[PDB]
Amino acid sequence: ITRTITSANIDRLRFTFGVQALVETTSKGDRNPSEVRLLVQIQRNGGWV
Amino acid sequence: TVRAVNAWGQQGDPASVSFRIAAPAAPSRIELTPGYFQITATPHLAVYD
Amino acid sequence: IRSVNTVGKSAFVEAVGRASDDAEGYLDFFKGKITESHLGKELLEKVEL
Amino acid sequence: TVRAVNAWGQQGDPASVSFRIAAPAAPSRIELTPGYFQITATPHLAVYDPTVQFEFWFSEKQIADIRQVETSTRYLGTALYWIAASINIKPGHDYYFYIRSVNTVGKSAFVEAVGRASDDAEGYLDFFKGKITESHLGKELLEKVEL
């Protein structure tokens, strides 16, 4: 996505992420978890740390 | 509708959500296995309930 | 047939079914096993002659 | 863990207990009553569990592995018994029921039961005593018995 906050008087940054739905449907029923992974990265000059 | 209140009893701005409880859907298909003077019918829905 | 639960009832769905087509399979294992007493009396008196 | 507190909010020493919620056990035995082109299978557990049912799976040929049951066989249903009746089901050929215990917590490992249909003998033919008289016989049989 990237947003380029470029603010002036910021002190700390809070990210509000989430998952729309995590079900994993199978035959009939008995849904299971999905175990997603996400990554939050800073600009840090050029290296996306 | 959910409203937040503080320790002084003052309510807050309301936040609303809407959902629905509906009758079960009609069966999608019916498997009809013939037998000796008998018929075995097994229904199947689009989604398992 | 229709879906039923504690909330409500759904509209019926029609399934047209037939019994067995009277195959020889239901006779295939009567192979050599109707001999002496399962036949009608007129048939007995016509086969004894 | 349970801790006691007084009216001043001070918690006490903790007291611990440990329990376990486990998947239902596999059925101990399977009673396979043959029928007319049908088999009635009733499972029985070592201990009765009012909160359990049984999933049945059908195989016309045996599979040594018990892991591909969900892939190599057909799903039959969940109940306390199963009356498998079909035209394609015929006596004299063995059939295999892979059954397991099912509930809201989990599923148990499958258990195999090899069953046969009825022997198809005079028990199903004494019903016919003195009743194939004039019209049930094939046309060649008619023209051979009229002569």
mmCIF file of all heavy atoms in Angstrom, chain C residues 9-48:
data_model
loop_
_atom_site.group_PDB
_atom_site.id
_atom_site.type_symbol
_atom_site.label_atom_id
_atom_site.label_comp_id
_atom_site.label_asym_id
_atom_site.label_seq_id
_atom_site.Cartn_x
_atom_site.Cartn_y
_atom_site.Cartn_z
ATOM 1 N N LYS C 9 -39.574 -22.632 8.880
ATOM 2 C CA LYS C 9 -39.654 -23.670 7.862
ATOM 3 C C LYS C 9 -39.486 -23.047 6.483
ATOM 4 O O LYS C 9 -39.951 -21.930 6.235
ATOM 5 C CB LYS C 9 -40.988 -24.418 7.941
ATOM 6 C CG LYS C 9 -40.912 -25.772 8.628
ATOM 7 C CD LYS C 9 -40.115 -25.702 9.918
ATOM 8 C CE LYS C 9 -40.931 -25.102 11.048
ATOM 9 N NZ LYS C 9 -40.088 -24.823 12.244
ATOM 10 N N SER C 10 -38.820 -23.771 5.592
ATOM 11 C CA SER C 10 -38.548 -23.297 4.245
ATOM 12 C C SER C 10 -39.577 -23.844 3.260
ATOM 13 O O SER C 10 -40.381 -24.722 3.578
ATOM 14 C CB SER C 10 -37.136 -23.695 3.811
ATOM 15 O OG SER C 10 -37.002 -25.101 3.728
ATOM 16 N N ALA C 11 -39.541 -23.302 2.047
ATOM 17 C CA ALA C 11 -40.437 -23.755 0.995
ATOM 18 C C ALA C 11 -40.044 -25.149 0.518
ATOM 19 O O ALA C 11 -38.867 -25.520 0.509
ATOM 20 C CB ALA C 11 -40.425 -22.776 -0.179
ATOM 21 N N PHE C 12 -41.048 -25.920 0.114
ATOM 22 C CA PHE C 12 -40.824 -27.304 -0.274
ATOM 23 C C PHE C 12 -40.074 -27.397 -1.598
ATOM 24 O O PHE C 12 -40.113 -26.489 -2.431
ATOM 25 C CB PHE C 12 -42.152 -28.049 -0.393
ATOM 26 C CG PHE C 12 -42.832 -28.296 0.921
ATOM 27 C CD1 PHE C 12 -43.963 -27.581 1.274
ATOM 28 C CD2 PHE C 12 -42.348 -29.250 1.796
ATOM 29 C CE1 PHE C 12 -44.595 -27.808 2.478
ATOM 30 C CE2 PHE C 12 -42.977 -29.482 3.003
ATOM 31 C CZ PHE C 12 -44.102 -28.760 3.343
ATOM 32 N N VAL C 13 -39.381 -28.517 -1.776
ATOM 33 C CA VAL C 13 -38.695 -28.867 -3.010
ATOM 34 C C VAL C 13 -39.168 -30.252 -3.421
ATOM 35 O O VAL C 13 -39.338 -31.139 -2.573
ATOM 36 C CB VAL C 13 -37.160 -28.835 -2.849
ATOM 37 C CG1 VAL C 13 -36.479 -29.111 -4.179
ATOM 38 C CG2 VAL C 13 -36.712 -27.496 -2.293
ATOM 39 N N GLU C 14 -39.397 -30.430 -4.719
ATOM 40 C CA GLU C 14 -39.977 -31.645 -5.271
ATOM 41 C C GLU C 14 -38.888 -32.568 -5.796
ATOM 42 O O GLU C 14 -37.945 -32.124 -6.458
ATOM 43 C CB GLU C 14 -40.957 -31.311 -6.396
ATOM 44 C CG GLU C 14 -41.302 -32.484 -7.299
ATOM 45 C CD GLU C 14 -42.300 -32.115 -8.380
ATOM 46 O OE1 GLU C 14 -41.872 -31.613 -9.441
ATOM 47 O OE2 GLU C 14 -43.512 -32.328 -8.170
ATOM 48 N N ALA C 15 -39.022 -33.859 -5.495
ATOM 49 C CA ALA C 15 -38.139 -34.888 -6.025
ATOM 50 C C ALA C 15 -38.992 -36.055 -6.496
ATOM 51 O O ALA C 15 -39.737 -36.641 -5.704
ATOM 52 C CB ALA C 15 -37.126 -35.346 -4.974
ATOM 53 N N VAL C 16 -38.890 -36.388 -7.777
ATOM 54 C CA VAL C 16 -39.635 -37.497 -8.363
ATOM 55 C C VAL C 16 -38.721 -38.712 -8.385
ATOM 56 O O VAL C 16 -37.628 -38.668 -8.961
ATOM 57 C CB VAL C 16 -40.143 -37.155 -9.771
ATOM 58 C CG1 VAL C 16 -41.103 -38.226 -10.258
ATOM 59 C CG2 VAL C 16 -40.817 -35.792 -9.773
ATOM 60 N N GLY C 17 -39.167 -39.799 -7.757
ATOM 61 C CA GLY C 17 -38.353 -40.984 -7.631
ATOM 62 C C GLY C 17 -39.113 -42.230 -8.043
ATOM 63 O O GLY C 17 -40.342 -42.287 -8.002
ATOM 64 N N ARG C 18 -38.342 -43.237 -8.439
ATOM 65 C CA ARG C 18 -38.861 -44.525 -8.870
ATOM 66 C C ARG C 18 -38.252 -45.628 -8.018
ATOM 67 O O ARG C 18 -37.165 -45.470 -7.454
ATOM 68 C CB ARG C 18 -38.543 -44.786 -10.348
ATOM 69 C CG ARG C 18 -39.652 -44.412 -11.311
ATOM 70 C CD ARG C 18 -40.850 -45.330 -11.155
ATOM 71 N NE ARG C 18 -41.834 -45.115 -12.209
ATOM 72 C CZ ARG C 18 -41.796 -45.702 -13.397
ATOM 73 N NH1 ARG C 18 -40.837 -46.554 -13.717
ATOM 74 N NH2 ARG C 18 -42.748 -45.430 -14.285
ATOM 75 N N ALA C 19 -38.961 -46.749 -7.929
ATOM 76 C CA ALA C 19 -38.422 -47.924 -7.269
ATOM 77 C C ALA C 19 -37.444 -48.635 -8.202
ATOM 78 O O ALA C 19 -37.084 -48.132 -9.270
ATOM 79 C CB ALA C 19 -39.550 -48.851 -6.826
ATOM 80 N N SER C 20 -37.001 -49.821 -7.795
ATOM 81 C CA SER C 20 -36.079 -50.588 -8.621
ATOM 82 C C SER C 20 -36.754 -51.007 -9.922
ATOM 83 O O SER C 20 -37.963 -51.247 -9.974
ATOM 84 C CB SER C 20 -35.577 -51.816 -7.861
ATOM 85 O OG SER C 20 -35.240 -52.866 -8.749
ATOM 86 N N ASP C 21 -35.957 -51.090 -10.984
ATOM 87 C CA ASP C 21 -36.459 -51.382 -12.320
ATOM 88 C C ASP C 21 -36.714 -52.865 -12.559
ATOM 89 O O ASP C 21 -36.877 -53.264 -13.718
ATOM 90 C CB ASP C 21 -35.482 -50.853 -13.373
ATOM 91 C CG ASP C 21 -34.069 -51.377 -13.179
ATOM 92 O OD1 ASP C 21 -33.857 -52.600 -13.311
ATOM 93 O OD2 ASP C 21 -33.168 -50.562 -12.890
ATOM 94 N N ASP C 22 -36.749 -53.682 -11.505
ATOM 95 C CA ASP C 22 -36.953 -55.127 -11.616
ATOM 96 C C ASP C 22 -35.876 -55.766 -12.496
ATOM 97 O O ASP C 22 -36.144 -56.341 -13.552
ATOM 98 C CB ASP C 22 -38.365 -55.446 -12.125
ATOM 99 C CG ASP C 22 -38.635 -56.938 -12.210
ATOM 100 O OD1 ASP C 22 -38.425 -57.647 -11.205
ATOM 101 O OD2 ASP C 22 -39.083 -57.397 -13.281
ATOM 102 N N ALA C 23 -34.635 -55.642 -12.037
ATOM 103 C CA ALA C 23 -33.529 -56.283 -12.724
ATOM 104 C C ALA C 23 -33.430 -57.749 -12.317
ATOM 105 O O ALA C 23 -34.018 -58.190 -11.325
ATOM 106 C CB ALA C 23 -32.217 -55.560 -12.421
ATOM 107 N N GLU C 24 -32.672 -58.510 -13.104
ATOM 108 C CA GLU C 24 -32.424 -59.906 -12.768
ATOM 109 C C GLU C 24 -31.430 -60.066 -11.628
ATOM 110 O O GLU C 24 -31.226 -61.195 -11.168
ATOM 111 C CB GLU C 24 -31.933 -60.670 -13.999
ATOM 112 C CG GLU C 24 -30.433 -60.594 -14.231
ATOM 113 C CD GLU C 24 -29.954 -59.178 -14.464
ATOM 114 O OE1 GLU C 24 -30.645 -58.427 -15.184
ATOM 115 O OE2 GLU C 24 -28.886 -58.815 -13.927
ATOM 116 N N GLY C 25 -30.802 -58.977 -11.176
ATOM 117 C CA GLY C 25 -29.921 -59.070 -10.023
ATOM 118 C C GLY C 25 -30.645 -59.570 -8.789
ATOM 119 O O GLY C 25 -30.155 -60.452 -8.079
ATOM 120 N N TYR C 26 -31.839 -59.029 -8.531
ATOM 121 C CA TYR C 26 -32.666 -59.530 -7.440
ATOM 122 C C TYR C 26 -33.062 -60.984 -7.644
ATOM 123 O O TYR C 26 -33.474 -61.640 -6.681
ATOM 124 C CB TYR C 26 -33.917 -58.662 -7.284
ATOM 125 C CG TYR C 26 -33.688 -57.393 -6.493
ATOM 126 C CD1 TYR C 26 -34.680 -56.428 -6.386
ATOM 127 C CD2 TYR C 26 -32.478 -57.160 -5.854
ATOM 128 C CE1 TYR C 26 -34.472 -55.267 -5.666
ATOM 129 C CE2 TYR C 26 -32.263 -56.003 -5.132
ATOM 130 C CZ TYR C 26 -33.262 -55.061 -5.041
ATOM 131 O OH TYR C 26 -33.047 -53.908 -4.322
ATOM 132 N N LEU C 27 -32.952 -61.496 -8.871
ATOM 133 C CA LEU C 27 -33.103 -62.915 -9.155
ATOM 134 C C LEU C 27 -31.784 -63.647 -9.328
ATOM 135 O O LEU C 27 -31.773 -64.880 -9.259
ATOM 136 C CB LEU C 27 -33.931 -63.121 -10.430
ATOM 137 C CG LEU C 27 -35.436 -62.921 -10.326
ATOM 138 C CD1 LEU C 27 -35.960 -62.295 -11.597
ATOM 139 C CD2 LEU C 27 -36.112 -64.255 -10.068
ATOM 140 N N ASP C 28 -30.679 -62.926 -9.544
ATOM 141 C CA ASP C 28 -29.428 -63.585 -9.903
ATOM 142 C C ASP C 28 -28.951 -64.532 -8.812
ATOM 143 O O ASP C 28 -28.313 -65.548 -9.110
ATOM 144 C CB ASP C 28 -28.348 -62.549 -10.204
ATOM 145 C CG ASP C 28 -26.988 -63.180 -10.428
ATOM 146 O OD1 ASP C 28 -26.813 -63.862 -11.460
ATOM 147 O OD2 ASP C 28 -26.098 -63.005 -9.571
ATOM 148 N N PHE C 29 -29.243 -64.226 -7.553
ATOM 149 C CA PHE C 29 -28.818 -65.088 -6.462
ATOM 150 C C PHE C 29 -29.882 -66.095 -6.052
ATOM 151 O O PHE C 29 -29.659 -66.861 -5.110
ATOM 152 C CB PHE C 29 -28.381 -64.245 -5.267
ATOM 153 C CG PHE C 29 -26.913 -63.949 -5.265
ATOM 154 C CD1 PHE C 29 -26.362 -63.093 -4.333
ATOM 155 C CD2 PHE C 29 -26.082 -64.524 -6.212
ATOM 156 C CE1 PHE C 29 -25.011 -62.824 -4.344
ATOM 157 C CE2 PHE C 29 -24.729 -64.257 -6.224
ATOM 158 C CZ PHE C 29 -24.193 -63.405 -5.288
ATOM 159 N N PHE C 30 -31.022 -66.118 -6.736
ATOM 160 C CA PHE C 30 -31.917 -67.265 -6.681
ATOM 161 C C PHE C 30 -31.470 -68.371 -7.624
ATOM 162 O O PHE C 30 -32.262 -69.269 -7.931
ATOM 163 C CB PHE C 30 -33.350 -66.841 -7.011
ATOM 164 C CG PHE C 30 -33.927 -65.840 -6.051
ATOM 165 C CD1 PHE C 30 -35.008 -65.056 -6.418
ATOM 166 C CD2 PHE C 30 -33.392 -65.682 -4.783
ATOM 167 C CE1 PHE C 30 -35.544 -64.135 -5.539
ATOM 168 C CE2 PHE C 30 -33.923 -64.762 -3.901
ATOM 169 C CZ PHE C 30 -35.000 -63.988 -4.280
ATOM 170 N N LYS C 31 -30.220 -68.310 -8.079
ATOM 171 C CA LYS C 31 -29.681 -69.245 -9.057
ATOM 172 C C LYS C 31 -29.785 -70.678 -8.562
ATOM 173 O O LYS C 31 -29.118 -71.065 -7.599
ATOM 174 C CB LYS C 31 -28.222 -68.886 -9.345
ATOM 175 C CG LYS C 31 -27.610 -69.619 -10.522
ATOM 176 C CD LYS C 31 -27.938 -68.929 -11.835
ATOM 177 C CE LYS C 31 -27.841 -67.415 -11.724
ATOM 178 N NZ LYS C 31 -26.439 -66.952 -11.534
ATOM 179 N N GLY C 32 -30.623 -71.461 -9.232
ATOM 180 C CA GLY C 32 -30.785 -72.862 -8.877
ATOM 181 C C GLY C 32 -31.339 -73.091 -7.489
ATOM 182 O O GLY C 32 -30.837 -73.957 -6.763
ATOM 183 N N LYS C 33 -32.364 -72.333 -7.095
ATOM 184 C CA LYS C 33 -32.859 -72.449 -5.732
ATOM 185 C C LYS C 33 -34.377 -72.441 -5.584
ATOM 186 O O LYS C 33 -34.854 -72.539 -4.449
ATOM 187 C CB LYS C 33 -32.252 -71.341 -4.856
ATOM 188 C CG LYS C 33 -31.519 -71.881 -3.635
ATOM 189 C CD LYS C 33 -30.931 -70.772 -2.783
ATOM 190 C CE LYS C 33 -29.647 -70.235 -3.389
ATOM 191 N NZ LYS C 33 -28.797 -69.570 -2.365
ATOM 192 N N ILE C 34 -35.151 -72.330 -6.660
ATOM 193 C CA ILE C 34 -36.593 -72.555 -6.589
ATOM 194 C C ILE C 34 -36.918 -73.849 -7.336
ATOM 195 O O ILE C 34 -36.933 -73.912 -8.564
ATOM 196 C CB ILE C 34 -37.407 -71.319 -7.027
ATOM 197 C CG1 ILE C 34 -36.950 -70.583 -8.310
ATOM 198 C CG2 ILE C 34 -37.485 -70.305 -5.894
ATOM 199 C CD1 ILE C 34 -36.824 -71.311 -9.591
ATOM 200 N N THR C 35 -37.137 -74.922 -6.572
ATOM 201 C CA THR C 35 -37.185 -76.265 -7.134
ATOM 202 C C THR C 35 -38.512 -76.985 -6.922
ATOM 203 O O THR C 35 -39.123 -77.435 -7.894
ATOM 204 C CB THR C 35 -36.032 -77.101 -6.554
ATOM 205 O OG1 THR C 35 -36.349 -78.495 -6.649
ATOM 206 C CG2 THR C 35 -35.773 -76.728 -5.102
ATOM 207 N N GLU C 36 -38.987 -77.111 -5.680
ATOM 208 C CA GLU C 36 -39.928 -78.190 -5.394
ATOM 209 C C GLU C 36 -41.218 -77.765 -4.697
ATOM 210 O O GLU C 36 -42.244 -78.437 -4.845
ATOM 211 C CB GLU C 36 -39.227 -79.266 -4.556
ATOM 212 C CG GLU C 36 -39.510 -79.222 -3.055
ATOM 213 C CD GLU C 36 -38.835 -78.061 -2.340
ATOM 214 O OE1 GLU C 36 -38.244 -77.190 -3.011
ATOM 215 O OE2 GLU C 36 -38.895 -78.024 -1.092
ATOM 216 N N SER C 37 -41.193 -76.678 -3.926
ATOM 217 C CA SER C 37 -42.356 -76.317 -3.125
ATOM 218 C C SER C 37 -42.800 -74.871 -3.287
ATOM 219 O O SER C 37 -43.879 -74.520 -2.799
ATOM 220 C CB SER C 37 -42.081 -76.593 -1.639
ATOM 221 O OG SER C 37 -40.900 -75.938 -1.211
ATOM 222 N N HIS C 38 -42.019 -74.030 -3.954
ATOM 223 C CA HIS C 38 -42.334 -72.619 -4.113
ATOM 224 C C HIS C 38 -43.243 -72.345 -5.304
ATOM 225 O O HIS C 38 -43.672 -71.203 -5.491
ATOM 226 C CB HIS C 38 -41.032 -71.827 -4.235
ATOM 227 C CG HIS C 38 -39.860 -72.524 -3.619
ATOM 228 N ND1 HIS C 38 -39.833 -72.904 -2.294
ATOM 229 C CD2 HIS C 38 -38.693 -72.951 -4.154
ATOM 230 C CE1 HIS C 38 -38.688 -73.510 -2.033
ATOM 231 N NE2 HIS C 38 -37.978 -73.552 -3.147
ATOM 232 N N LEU C 39 -43.579 -73.373 -6.075
ATOM 233 C CA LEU C 39 -44.347 -73.256 -7.304
ATOM 234 C C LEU C 39 -45.817 -73.575 -7.055
ATOM 235 O O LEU C 39 -46.160 -74.343 -6.152
ATOM 236 C CB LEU C 39 -43.771 -74.173 -8.397
ATOM 237 C CG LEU C 39 -43.622 -75.703 -8.299
ATOM 238 C CD1 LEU C 39 -42.470 -76.159 -9.181
ATOM 239 C CD2 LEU C 39 -43.411 -76.246 -6.893
ATOM 240 N N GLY C 40 -46.682 -72.965 -7.864
ATOM 241 C CA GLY C 40 -48.111 -73.118 -7.667
ATOM 242 C C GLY C 40 -48.594 -74.525 -7.966
ATOM 243 O O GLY C 40 -47.998 -75.262 -8.751
ATOM 244 N N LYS C 41 -49.722 -74.885 -7.341
ATOM 245 C CA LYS C 41 -50.228 -76.254 -7.423
ATOM 246 C C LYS C 41 -50.573 -76.643 -8.855
ATOM 247 O O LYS C 41 -50.306 -77.775 -9.280
ATOM 248 C CB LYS C 41 -51.451 -76.414 -6.521
ATOM 249 C CG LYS C 41 -52.075 -77.796 -6.571
ATOM 250 C CD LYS C 41 -51.089 -78.866 -6.129
ATOM 251 C CE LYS C 41 -50.596 -78.619 -4.711
ATOM 252 N NZ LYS C 41 -51.719 -78.349 -3.771
ATOM 253 N N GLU C 42 -51.181 -75.725 -9.607
ATOM 254 C CA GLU C 42 -51.443 -75.998 -11.014
ATOM 255 C C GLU C 42 -50.145 -76.270 -11.758
ATOM 256 O O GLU C 42 -50.079 -77.168 -12.605
ATOM 257 C CB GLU C 42 -52.198 -74.833 -11.652
ATOM 258 C CG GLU C 42 -53.433 -74.394 -10.881
ATOM 259 C CD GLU C 42 -53.675 -72.901 -10.975
ATOM 260 O OE1 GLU C 42 -53.676 -72.372 -12.105
ATOM 261 O OE2 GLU C 42 -53.862 -72.257 -9.922
ATOM 262 N N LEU C 43 -49.095 -75.516 -11.441
ATOM 263 C CA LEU C 43 -47.809 -75.769 -12.076
ATOM 264 C C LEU C 43 -47.264 -77.136 -11.673
ATOM 265 O O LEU C 43 -46.677 -77.838 -12.503
ATOM 266 C CB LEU C 43 -46.827 -74.647 -11.739
ATOM 267 C CG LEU C 43 -45.541 -74.565 -12.570
ATOM 268 C CD1 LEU C 43 -44.428 -75.406 -11.987
ATOM 269 C CD2 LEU C 43 -45.812 -74.965 -14.014
ATOM 270 N N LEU C 44 -47.459 -77.538 -10.410
ATOM 271 C CA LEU C 44 -47.047 -78.877 -9.992
ATOM 272 C C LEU C 44 -47.740 -79.947 -10.822
ATOM 273 O O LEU C 44 -47.092 -80.858 -11.352
ATOM 274 C CB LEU C 44 -47.350 -79.119 -8.510
ATOM 275 C CG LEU C 44 -46.412 -78.672 -7.387
ATOM 276 C CD1 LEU C 44 -46.767 -77.296 -6.903
ATOM 277 C CD2 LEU C 44 -46.446 -79.661 -6.231
ATOM 278 N N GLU C 45 -49.066 -79.856 -10.945
ATOM 279 C CA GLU C 45 -49.787 -80.894 -11.667
ATOM 280 C C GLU C 45 -49.538 -80.833 -13.167
ATOM 281 O O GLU C 45 -49.755 -81.835 -13.857
ATOM 282 C CB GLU C 45 -51.288 -80.819 -11.367
ATOM 283 C CG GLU C 45 -51.924 -79.463 -11.591
ATOM 284 C CD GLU C 45 -52.385 -79.257 -13.019
ATOM 285 O OE1 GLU C 45 -52.517 -80.258 -13.753
ATOM 286 O OE2 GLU C 45 -52.616 -78.093 -13.407
ATOM 287 N N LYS C 46 -49.079 -79.695 -13.691
ATOM 288 C CA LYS C 46 -48.701 -79.640 -15.098
ATOM 289 C C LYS C 46 -47.276 -80.116 -15.355
ATOM 290 O O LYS C 46 -46.968 -80.524 -16.480
ATOM 291 C CB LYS C 46 -48.868 -78.222 -15.652
ATOM 292 C CG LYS C 46 -50.302 -77.715 -15.661
ATOM 293 C CD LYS C 46 -50.375 -76.254 -16.083
ATOM 294 C CE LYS C 46 -49.404 -75.392 -15.292
ATOM 295 N NZ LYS C 46 -50.098 -74.353 -14.482
ATOM 296 N N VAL C 47 -46.396 -80.074 -14.352
ATOM 297 C CA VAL C 47 -45.028 -80.541 -14.560
ATOM 298 C C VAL C 47 -44.820 -81.992 -14.140
ATOM 299 O O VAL C 47 -43.801 -82.591 -14.511
ATOM 300 C CB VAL C 47 -44.003 -79.661 -13.821
ATOM 301 C CG1 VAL C 47 -44.088 -78.222 -14.300
ATOM 302 C CG2 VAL C 47 -44.195 -79.759 -12.314
ATOM 303 N N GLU C 48 -45.744 -82.572 -13.373
ATOM 304 C CA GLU C 48 -45.589 -83.969 -12.980
ATOM 305 C C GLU C 48 -45.961 -84.918 -14.112
ATOM 306 O O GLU C 48 -45.561 -86.087 -14.094
ATOM 307 C CB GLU C 48 -46.435 -84.266 -11.741
ATOM 308 C CG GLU C 48 -47.915 -83.958 -11.908
ATOM 309 C CD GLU C 48 -48.753 -85.202 -12.134
ATOM 310 O OE1 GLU C 48 -48.193 -86.230 -12.567
ATOM 311 O OE2 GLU C 48 -49.974 -85.151 -11.876
#
